[PDB]
Design a protein around this ligand. Structure first.
Ligand code: HEM
Ligand SMILES: C[C@@H](/C=N\O)c1cccc(Br)c1
Length: 339
């Protein structure tokens, strides 16, 4: 609450996850099939989707489609557990072992496999929701409550309990190295990340918007989001953004719905903060959002939310099997070949 302004009174309501006392960790797993034609991914996606309904399966799973550059796509599962023990039991199930860690991927395969598994201690985790919505990531299975801790720069950091006792800076300092090009196709590679990287899933949901509000979101706001994500992807060193994906969410048979999110990793929470507060790209987003609020009497059916975590090296398992060299963390930090 260090950054809360004096006489703080927010002009809009917001909600935040309230984790139960017995809950110590969230496991958030991003599992992806990389392809040039979705046809080639279809077999792998069926096997994975049947795995999620095991009794040890995730409390919640989203599906999303990422358009990468060079014409590669990632078909992604976003899966949540509230017990690390249960997630370990899921991975050990033989149904999961049939495909886990890219086991079904060939040396000359047309598809790649990747997984980014982050085990998030609850005191390094915070969410924010623009409405009392129980279909926003962990709000599918965790209660949410009203909070006044928003609507100022620094509110995100204040909502994360550990920021009261840690600056959450990176051991590598302020300068993320330039991305390097590694020979990743044909190989099973593991990346080891530094401590205190910051992960954000920030989401947009215009599915309940009226016709006119939807027109405004798609015509005015979404283009600035697309531009922001492209900037982030192309300017890693300047921003401290290790990886940024704009993805469109899907029904579980693959139909794209009116929902998206950006999933980004940053060298520290401070890099995310400085980009959000100072860079023109997020300012244009905030501007067009406010313009959208003025047009509809400041009462929107657009749902916004995010989940932000700060991660230790040992809590991030990053695996890339036959993937494009720009996928995820592949351009950064320490890589090890697995065999
Ligand atoms: C690349 C995509 C995005 C990133 C990385 C991002 C990042 C962030 C972060 C980190 C904050 C919290 C800053 C703090 O509390 O100190 C924030 C706040 C905010 N963002 Fe974004 N954002 C993105 C997209 C969007 C979109 C699409 C919208 C609206 C359509 C939006 C509107 C806002 C608003 C209104 C706030 C203030 C929230 C509050 O505290 O009440 N952002 N953003
Ligand atoms: C989730 C965040 C945006 N980006 O992380 C946001 C945006 C608008 C209103 C609220 Br309330 C929260």
């Amino acid at each position: 609450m260090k950054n809360m302004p004096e006489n703080h009174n927010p002009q809009a309501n917001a909600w935040t996850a309230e984790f139960p006392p017995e809950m110590s960790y969230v496991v958030f797993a991003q599992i992806g099939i990389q392809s040039k034609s979705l046809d080639h991914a279809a077999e792998h996606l069926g096997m994975m989707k049947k795995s999620f309904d095991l009794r040890t399966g995730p409390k919640h799973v989203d599906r999303a489609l990422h358009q990468g550059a060079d014409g590669y796509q990632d078909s992604i599962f976003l899966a949540y557990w509230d017990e690390p023990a249960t997630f370990k039991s899921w991975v050990a199930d033989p149904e999961v072992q049939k495909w886990w860690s890219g086991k079904k991927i060939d040396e000359n395969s047309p598809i790649g496999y990747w997984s980014e598994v982050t085990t998030i201690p609850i005191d390094h985790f915070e969410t924010l929701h623009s409405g009392e919505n129980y279909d926003n990531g962990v709000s599918h299975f965790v209660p949410i409550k009203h909070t006044e801790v928003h609507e100022y720069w620094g509110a995100m950091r204040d909502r994360m309990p550990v920021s009261a006792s840690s600056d959450l800076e990176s051991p590598l300092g302020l300068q993320l190295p330039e991305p390097i090009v590694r020979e990743s196709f044909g190989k099973r590679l593991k990346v080891t990340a530094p401590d205190n990287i910051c992960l954000i899933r920030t989401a947009q949901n215009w599915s309940k918007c009226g016709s006119g509000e939807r027109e405004t979101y798609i015509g005015l706001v979404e283009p600035t989001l697309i531009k922001a994500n492209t900037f982030l992807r192309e300017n890693a060193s300047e921003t401290g953004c290790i990886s940024s994906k704009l993805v469109y969410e899907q029904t579980h048979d693959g139909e794209i719905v009116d929902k998206s999110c950006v999933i980004g990793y940053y060298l520290s929470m401070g890099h995310l903060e400085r980009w959000t507060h100072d860079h023109p790209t997020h300012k244009a987003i905030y501007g067009t959002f406010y313009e959208m609020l003025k047009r509809h009497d400041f009462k929107t059916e657009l749902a916004l939310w995010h989940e932000v975590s700060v991660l230790q090296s040992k809590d991030i398992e990053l695996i890339y099997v036959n993937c494009h060299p720009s996928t995820g963390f592949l351009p950064f930090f320490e890589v090890t070949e697995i065999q």
